[PDB]
């Protein structure tokens, strides 16, 4: 006989119990200031922990953590439409706009000790060259990337690294197992340009085939499946993404061929073909042409329903937005002479290179007042104690008790040591991690029509 | 064929799929099992799903 195994209580999206008002509030910020070197933060050479000049690239991850003021700690003339005791207040984003006031342009870089061997693009005449050191100074390009993504929870990283090995075993080579790990997408770390999403420090014994800024890095990929796996709907509210790529040239690696090809599939030769050439090829990442018209940004982007069970709603007065643009990631170049003459020499001039970015924002929201009932208050602590305790209302004990005394004593630690575990509240898990932060708490506005998105908005609503 | 209004979900978890682009490698001097198979994407990709 067979039966349905388990009946489970139902989950409900944030629409039906959410009581919406019709009062809207603005967000929008001033000029952004953040700059750095494209490849590496200049340490001070004396104290190489503190910076001399920082690092920022377009190839870095750009995730942002925002801060919003308290809805309940606000002054309002008429609380007539709700009970302040029975209701609570919360924000959801419904009107959105992100632009950038820079021109376009992609930066180009490379690596000065690149482990090339020969041109596998058009001609590899026989025989090949020898050499102990066969590195060169060459440059390379990147796939073009655009996206825009938003949720109240931070985006998840996932990224490669070494894998689950076995015991002492006999008949294999180093056939290295590989296991992915998951993380959260942080700020400042590098993104992928088509070379796989791994660490480049732990996997580069040479570190002489990888570009200079990613010469030690660990680029991630976003776990779109796993970010579509949480039924909260709160880590993604809306997403866009756009990429393009082709390849220009083809070359091979240079080194001892780690594994061999079986002779069953080719003829062995002699003379110039008594050797077997290296053939560990690779492409050349290039990306593609840019338009003024394939943009994902600088337009009004209204939301009507977020892509999951949460309807654009923030928790803890915060969101998490990710944007990429290598499209505006070109770089400046400096030249200062040291001396003066009427004769040109290259050993007179000093050249620096910088990398600049600006960002800006404009938003509008809407108050959804939330009443507090018994089935509601049971529902939230199953998700979070954290979104409850802010209201200063009271506390519900997470057990009502258990069936075990668990070895009560009074005698205080004299014979047999066990674990005592001193905790700490620690007030955020994010205390170890870095994002870019912004304020709203005095950028507040109820009016919309002094503001272009609010000027964009009231023609959508016709008011 | 009739028609019911009785719909059902079917969704799998994450899969292990990784390995050598070029050729399978047998065990040397055994050559009946393989160490790492040829794992290549340009090949065709069939999967025999099992449904109740």
Instruction: Give dist(CA A235, CA A149) in Å, integer.
Output: 10
Strand order through the sheet with A63-66: A238-244, A144-151, A320-325, A63-66, A436-438
What are the boundaries of each domain within chain A? 18-461
Least Cα distance to A92 among A235, A298, A306 occurs for A306
Chain B residues lying within 8 Å of A262, measured CB to CB: 23
Phi/psi of residue A154, nearest 5 degrees? -70, 150
CA distance, residue B12 to nearest chain A CA (Å) = 11
- Max Cα–Cα distance, chain B, nearest Å: 60
Give the three-class secondary structure for A265.
helix
Give the three-class secondary structure for A19.
strand
CA distances from A44 to A41, A49, A211, A353, A406 (A): 9, 8, 23, 17, 56
Instruction: Give dist(CA A265, CA A378) in Å, integer.
Output: 68
Stated resolution in angstroms: 6.4
CB neighbourhood size of A226 (10 A): 13
Instruction: Give dist(CA A150, CA A240) in Å, integer.
Output: 9
Phi/psi of residue A148, nearest 5 degrees? -150, 135
CA angle A177, A181, A183 (to 5 degrees): 165
Least Cα distance to A435 among A264, A187, A250 occurs for A187
Q: Where are the beta strands (DSSP E) in B1-52?
A: 25-26, 34-36
Q: Where are the beta strands (DSSP E) in A214-258?
A: 221-222, 238-244, 247-252
Radius of gyration of chain B (CA): 19
Instruction: Give dist(CA A288, CA A255) in Å, integer.
Output: 31
Instruction: Give dist(CA A189, CA A216) in Å, integer.
Output: 11
Report yes or no: A333 and A423 within 8 Å, Cβ to Cβ: no
CA distance, residue B9 to nearest chain A CA (Å) = 14
Give the three-class secondary structure for A353.
coil
Phi/psi of residue A380, nearest 5 degrees? -80, -40
CB contact under 8 A, A172 and B27: yes
Instruction: Give dist(CA A216, CA A195) in Å, integer.
Output: 14
Least Cα distance to A140 among A159, A163, A121, A114 occurs for A114
Q: How was this one solved? A: cryo-EM
CB contact under 8 A, A172 and B23: no
Q: Where are the beta strands (DSSP E) in B11-51?
A: 25-26, 34-36
The residues with which A139 forms a beta bridge, in sequence order, are A110
User: How many A-B residue pairs are in contact by the CB < 8 A criterion?
Assistant: 17
Chain B residues lying within 8 Å of A166, measured CB to CB: none
Phi/psi of residue A101, nearest 5 degrees? -95, 40
> Quick one: three-class SS letters along A84-131?
CCCEEEEEEEEEEEEECCCCCCCCCEEEEEECCCCECCCCCCCCCCCC
Instruction: Give dist(CA A73, CA A199) in Å, integer.
Output: 46
Phi/psi of residue A374, nearest 5 degrees? -70, -45
CB contact under 8 A, A171 and B23: no
Which DSSP state fits A455?
H
Query: With an 8 Å Cβ cutoff, is B18 touching chain A?
Result: yes
Instruction: Give dist(CA A298, CA A442) in Å, integer.
Output: 24
């Amino acid at each position: 006989v067979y039966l349905p195994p388990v009946p489970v209580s139902k989950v409900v999206s944030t629409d039906e119990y959410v009581s919406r008002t019709s009062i809207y509030y603005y967000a929008g910020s001033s000029r952004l200031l953040a700059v750095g070197n494209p490849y590496f933060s200049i340490k001070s050479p004396n104290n190489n922990k503190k910076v001399l000049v920082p690092k920022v690239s377009g190839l870095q991850y750009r995730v942002f953590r925002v801060r919003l003021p308290d809805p309940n700690k606000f002054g309002f003339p008429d609380t007539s439409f709700y009970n302040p005791d029975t209701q609570r207040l919360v924000w959801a984003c419904v009107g959105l706009e992100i632009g950038r006031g820079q021109p376009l342009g992609v930066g180009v870089s490379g690596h000065p000790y690149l482990n090339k061997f020969d041109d596998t693009e058009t001609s590899n005449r026989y025989p090949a060259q020898p050499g102990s050191d066969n590195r060169e100074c060459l440059s390379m390009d990147y796939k073009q990337t655009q996206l825009c993504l938003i949720g109240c929870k931070p985006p998840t990283g996932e990224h490669w690294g070494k894998g689950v090995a076995c015991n002492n075993n006999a008949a294999a080579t180093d056939c290295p197992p590989l296991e992915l790990f998951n993380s959260i997408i942080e700020d400042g770390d590098m993104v992928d340009t088509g070379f796989g999403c791994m660490d480049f420090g732990t996997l580069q014994a040479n570190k002489s085939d990888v570009p200079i800024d990613i010469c030690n890095s660990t680029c991630k990929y976003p776990d779109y499946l796993k970010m579509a796996s949480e039924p909260y709907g709160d880590s993604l509210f809306f997403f866009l993404r756009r990429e393009q790529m082709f390849v220009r040239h083809f070359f091979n690696r240079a080194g001892k061929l780690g594994e061999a090809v079986p002779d069953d599939l080719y003829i062995k030769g002699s003379g110039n073909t008594a050797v077997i050439q290296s053939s560990a090829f690779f492409p050349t990442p290039s990306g593609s042409i840019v338009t003024s018209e394939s943009q994902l940004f600088n337009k009004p982007y209204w939301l009507q329903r977020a892509q999951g069970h949460n309807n654009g709603i923030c928790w803890g007065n915060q969101l998490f937005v990710t944007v990429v643009d290598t499209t505006r990631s070109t770089n400046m170049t400096l030249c200062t002479e040291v001396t003066k003459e009427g004769t040109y020499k290259n050993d007179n001039f000093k050249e620096y290179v910088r990398h600049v970015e600006e960002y800006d924002l404009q938003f509008v929201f809407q108050l959804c007042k939330i009443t507090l009932t018994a089935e509601i208050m049971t529902y939230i602590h199953t998700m979070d104690s954290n979104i409850l305790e802010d209201w200063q209302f009271g506390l519900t004990p997470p057990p009502s008790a258990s069936l075990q005394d668990t070895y009560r004593f009074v005698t205080s630690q004299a014979i047999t040591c066990q674990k005592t575990a001193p905790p700490k509240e620690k007030e955020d898990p994010l205390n170890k991690y870095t994002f870019w932060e912004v304020n709203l708490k005095e950028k507040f506005s109820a009016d919309l029509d002094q503001f272009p998105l609010g000027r964009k908005f009231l023609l959508q609503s016709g008011l």
